[PDB]
Design a binder for this molecule. Structure first.
Ligand code: FMN
Ligand code: FMN
Lengths: 120, 120
């Protein structure tokens, strides 16, 4: 597990896939923008993510990839994760406050991780 | 357009989303692993991508995010793209050869770009 937390601190772009009625949608954030709480909750600051919110309002299911070449994984150098969870947009509580330093943030995207597999 | 080509040369992880019958799927590669040909074709070396190929055999539609903080975009520092295209697995031709230096590559994933929007 300690691999995952070292990845959060490093440089890297996160990818977030949602399910629409017109196919998947795909958006980004930075590894270091993420905030982890208890209950397997990863919190994302929301500036835009309008299409994403539309998709999530209808289908909680989300996928996320993140990693870093600086954190050593399965076959030595580098590591990547594929995370499956359920998503929710929150405007209040501990989850919104975790990302509150991002003054531009209109909401928090809260991903509750159901599984994480190392892909690298 | 010259922004896109500068992004390919830089450090960065690409995200590729496909449509399954069980929801979206999401896989990675590196910006510098990509190969661009004419006909709006971006070529990806395939080592694994078994679930991805299953999804693509059924639904050509694909989304891709890639970028770099080192290439200056819309609001100054950084740039990201969201690419929509159609995918195909090729085992021969110019498209496979473009990625042939990757000896581990069993195939080429060929993305024909229908649209690219700057997201950063
Ligand atoms: C590297 C990168 C990081 C980004 N970080 C965020 C972010 O932290 N929060 C956010 O709302 N959008 C971020 N964006 C923009 C989103 O990917 C997305 O385009 C925008 O939020 C609109 O979302 P939507 O397409 O679901 O409407 C980032 C884009 C890039 C390329
Ligand atoms: C940073 C990173 C780069 C990767 N590059 C490739 C790649 O270039 N080609 C490839 O087949 N898989 C690559 N992978 C692994 C794929 O994301 C994926 O897990 C694997 O190919 C299996 O595909 P599938 O889940 O569709 O079966 C990479 C993973 C990471 C984290």
């Amino acid at each position: 597990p300690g691999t995952f937390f070292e990845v959060l601190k490093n440089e890297g772009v996160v990818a977030i896939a949602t399910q629409g009625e017109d196919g998947p949608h795909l958006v980004n954030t930075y590894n270091s923008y993420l905030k982890v709480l208890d209950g397997n909750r990863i919190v994302v600051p929301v500036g835009g993510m309008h299409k994403t919110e539309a998709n999530v309002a209808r289908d909680e299911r989300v996928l996320m990839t993140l990693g870093s070449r600086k954190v050593a994984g399965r076959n030595g150098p580098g590591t990547g994760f594929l995370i499956r969870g359920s998503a929710a947009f929150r405007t209040d509580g501990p989850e919104f406050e975790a990302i509150a330093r991002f003054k531009w943030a209109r909401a928090a995207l809260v991903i509750t991780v159901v599984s994480a597999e190392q892909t690298l």
